[PDB]
Chain A
Amino acid sequence: DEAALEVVLAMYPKYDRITNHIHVRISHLPLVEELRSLRQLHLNQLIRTSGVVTSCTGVLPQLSMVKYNCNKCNFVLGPFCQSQNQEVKPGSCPECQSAGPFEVNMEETIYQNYQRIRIQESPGKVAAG
């Protein structure tokens, strides 16, 4: 993604006005897998699967780089990266050490589009019954 951004801004120097990140997508990866055949050996590896989408959430905003107002003073906590694993807890304010009911700074927080889908095996690839 970093390298693609460099090449894109070499070709179109003003494209930073439209984007701040280029997502490199990979297609025709030979590592095709059946959903029924995924194992622990495939963990943290780039897999390719097929299926029918059976559920979709609405497009929801998700925290990506979140900033928090301090619960007492006017300081704002540093950028914390969202992980998909757990809620990010701010910790304590480094100006004053308070750790109370912190709140998200919506205007300074960076969001990203989120959508959780459920895919299953296609009905013609599953066995009867």
Chain B
Amino acid sequence: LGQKLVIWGTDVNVAACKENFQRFLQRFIDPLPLYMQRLGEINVIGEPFLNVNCEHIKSFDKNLYRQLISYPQEVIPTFDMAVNEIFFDRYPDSILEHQIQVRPFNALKTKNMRNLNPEDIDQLITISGMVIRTSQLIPEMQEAFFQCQVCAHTTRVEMDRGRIAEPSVCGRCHTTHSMALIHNRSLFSDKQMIKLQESPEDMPAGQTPHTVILFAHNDLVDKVQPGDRVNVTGIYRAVPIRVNPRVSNVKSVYKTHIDVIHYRKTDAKSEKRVELLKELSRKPDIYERLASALAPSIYEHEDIKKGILLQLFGGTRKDGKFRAEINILLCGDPGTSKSQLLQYVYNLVPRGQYTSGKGSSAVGLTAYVMKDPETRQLVLQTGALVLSDNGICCIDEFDKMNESTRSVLHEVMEQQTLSIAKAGIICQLNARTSVLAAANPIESQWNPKKTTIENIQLPHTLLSRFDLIFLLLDPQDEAYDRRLAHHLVALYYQSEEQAEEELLDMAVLKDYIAYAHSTIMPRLSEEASQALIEAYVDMRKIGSSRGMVSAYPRQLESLIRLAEAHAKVRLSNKVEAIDVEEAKRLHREALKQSATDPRTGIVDISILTTGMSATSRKR
């Protein structure tokens, strides 16, 4: 009889605790009838858990909060009984896969990892931390299935605090030691170990971080990945560890872990958007508005931002084998805004990647095979170019990569696939990725006398794959530098009402790009086709006259990509001479920047070859 129960060594009545929690659920209303709304949400969604705020419990009833914190192992099952009783007193014929779990949580940490003490054992705590590792899924047996190997009579045994009461005899027949555990007829539930470090923001000065073990079960297992930051609420357990696996002597010093009751992630940061985006797309100069919205924190390079915008939108993928991906390269000294552009667009785009061409990079560009250290089994770590198979791959320090990595990037750009010839493994991985690269001069600062290729010292074959190439040189001009300095001091005097506005602009830019990618699929009009065709012939004219060469057919492919992307930006769904003219303009601006020899002007064969015509006749 439930009314006779008290928690062991506690003097708290289980029935009274259940009634107090029931009236809490029935009458708490003011977070600004609260939790009956959550019960209805459970009823329609079908998720068997209820999140409850311990501060709400405290403000409703201090004593109930004290009981919950002190004796969670009994009080939380009491709350489960309370909530299930209420839920099935209402909604009488709704069906749930499981009984509801109450998941009490504190909004902020009550303790930190360094101050956890034996006084806190079997007590509900909340702590903040960063996740270091997450184990494979561990099945925990919940009900053992036994079958008699003599007469096939079966029985089921319930789990008593982690040990089985194995039947020593059969019931149907009477043979001894005949009941065998049928492992895959038994019942199991999910379990997982998590290793959690104290946050860098929470560590004391100059100390090595402390770490705790969490154990999650059932539905909380697969909610947290390594690198995440979480406020975890759970019961601080202490368990013995046996001195060696074949002996039941245990060390006097106990191991500790946290049974997870609740996770709250603390580093995470439709028609109501579509209606805005539809009219905003037909607003005038939306192209300029989006391009200027890109990277507000730096002084403006209009054509660089326009090219990055068209890279984000991309062409149209169709089938044959032509890449819709657009490749962009940025050049300039160290200390220019190119790395800020890379990091910004990596934060912006979905399926993005950011890595360094240098061999010291955090995640490599090429794919490799390694022994998973926590498992010892091989894992195929596909590089960033394969991980960004439907996004932008940002490559900082693009000049410093070794020749093997240059070959890998040549393969990825030409074929949009990465070959795997690892030991045993043979496969063709997919790398339909838009590469945004940032190179440096081999010298300290950009040599004006030498060409782009002569300064960055990358092969002309790989340079020829990029659709656009730009330079971040700053003039020795007061007209530019004075206004840049004004922009910089204003950026210091940035405030939160500007931060929110720029965040809203970036968010609607994200929604715009996602909505474009979702459905909008441009096609070529006849006038656009004629414009592209005569554009290729026009680019060939200037070189074919006088006997040199000024263009080659892959530039027509680049122009097609840019025109399709611009139609995608303006939501036209039909490519037109407007898009083709913008493509020609931006492509020729990129050529004016990158392909300009200091003596003879724009030379096309400086991309097809190392050096240029003047050098070829100087030697």
Contact = CB atoms under 8 A, between A and B. Distances in A.
Any A–B CB pair closer than 8 Å: yes
Interface of A: 129
B426 interface: yes
Contacts of A129: 421, 424-426
Contacts of B424: 129
Nearest to B420: A129
A1 B408 CA distance: 63
A128 to B, nearest CB: 8
A129 B425 CA distance: 7
Contacts of B421: 129
Q: Interface SS of chain A: helix, strand, loop or mixed?
A: loop
Nearest to A127: B426
Contacts of B425: 129
Interface in B382-425: 421, 424-425
A129 B421 CA distance: 6
A116 to B, nearest CB: 26
Interface in B287-331: none
A129 B419 CA distance: 12
4 contacts: A129-B421, A129-B424, A129-B425, A129-B426
Interface in B422-473: 424-426
Nearest to B422: A129
B34 to A, nearest CB: 62
Contacts of B426: 129
Closest 3 CB pairs of A and B: A129-B426, A129-B421, A129-B424
Interface string B57-94: 00000000000000000000000000000000000000
A16 B312 CA distance: 90
B316 to A, nearest CB: 35
A129 B426 CA distance: 7
B369 to A, nearest CB: 12
B583 to A, nearest CB: 42
B367 to A, nearest CB: 14
A129 B424 CA distance: 6
B421 to A, nearest CB: 5
A127 to B, nearest CB: 8
Interface string B270-291: 0000000000000000000000
B551 to A, nearest CB: 41
Interface string B161-185: 0000000000000000000000000
B425 to A, nearest CB: 8
A42 B426 CA distance: 30
Nearest to A129: B426
Nearest to B426: A129
A85 to B, nearest CB: 27
A119 B425 CA distance: 22
A7 B29 CA distance: 106
Nearest to B424: A129
A75 B421 CA distance: 65
Nearest to B427: A129
Nearest to B421: A129
A55 B425 CA distance: 25
A129 B423 CA distance: 6
A31 B146 CA distance: 47
A10 to B, nearest CB: 56
B190 to A, nearest CB: 36
A58 to B, nearest CB: 30
B517 to A, nearest CB: 36
Nearest to B423: A129
B471 to A, nearest CB: 43
B522 to A, nearest CB: 41
B426 to A, nearest CB: 5
A128 B421 CA distance: 9
Nearest to B425: A129
A36 to B, nearest CB: 14
A129 B427 CA distance: 10
A126 to B, nearest CB: 11
A82 B428 CA distance: 52
A129 to B, nearest CB: 5
B25 to A, nearest CB: 62
A116 B500 CA distance: 75
